[PDB]
């Protein structure tokens, strides 16, 4: 139970840090972020970003070769959901 949370918090801490050491963007982007699921870099607007499924997932050894996707709008804004929350395509990563 908790152990999952602990691995998850580990993942977050690690991308909050991983992302400090980054150069400023040279173009219109979507600010880097931890959307509570995966760690995203600065992504150019109107493009879709990819990531290997996050490792805190219990089945990460079976989806290690899979990807999670997040769309960055032409706006320079990541696409949000129905209620405005962090949004993404993790179908590949689901059980």
């Amino acid at each position, epitope marked *: 139970m908790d152990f*999952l*949370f602990e691995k*998850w918090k580990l993942y977050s801490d690690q991308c909050h840090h991983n992302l400090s050491l980054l150069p400023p963007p040279t173009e219109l982007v979507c600010n880097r972020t931890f959307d*509570k*699921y995966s760690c995203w870099p600065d992504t150019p607007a109107n493009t879709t970003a990819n990531i290997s499924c996050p490792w*805190y*997932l*219990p089945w990460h050894h079976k989806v290690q070769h899979r990807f999670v996707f997040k769309r960055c709008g032409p706006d320079g804004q990541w696409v*949000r*959901g*129905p*209620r*405005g*929350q*962090p949004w*993404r395509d*993790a179908s590949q*990563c*689901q*059980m």
Partner: antibody
Amino acid sequence: QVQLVESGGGVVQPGRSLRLSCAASGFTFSSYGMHWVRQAPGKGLEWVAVMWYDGSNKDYVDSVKGRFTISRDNSKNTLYLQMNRLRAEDTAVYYCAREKDHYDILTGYNYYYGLDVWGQGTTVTVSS
Amino acid sequence: DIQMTQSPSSLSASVGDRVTITCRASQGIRNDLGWYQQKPGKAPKRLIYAASSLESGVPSRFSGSGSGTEFTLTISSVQPEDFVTYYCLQHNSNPLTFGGGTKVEIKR
């Protein structure tokens, strides 16, 4: 006794600004999303604004976009509603409501449970 | 923008009647919906949550039903204090939307 208490209502001239407040008690204010709902005198209910923890997830009903600002002070468990460039349609009773959400780690989905607790309300009358 | 068509705007009842209030959502909203009662001069008070769940401390005569696009609020036998306004609220998508409301009036 979980409660919400609103203050700051009154008479304000069109064009001018008002600040509303919603004091909370009986619960941990930070762990919840807060809403504002208003009701013109003889009319029904209309959702106005909503914030969260971050608060990077603020939404407003179209008619108040760029005019109202919602904010919260977690140090003092209080919700605010900045009302600027007021006009006739803003005349109403304003309630504040509480809503619980839930983040699933495994699925990465966010679940919302709707508005469960309101305040007594506070009246805003726009007039010269 | 999800529309909540509520019916009827006002109805007529004698204590003991069964009252049925319908709410039709323009978009599938799964079960993210609640019914509200508002007594005159007072703030709304949720009765049904998650479409069919009953808030704790509410009479057993109130029941909600439906999912997706069609929802229903029922009062098995209207009571004297129940003759007041009722609202449905959708929390599926921003902005949040209410039905027009139903004013339940006692008949003579």
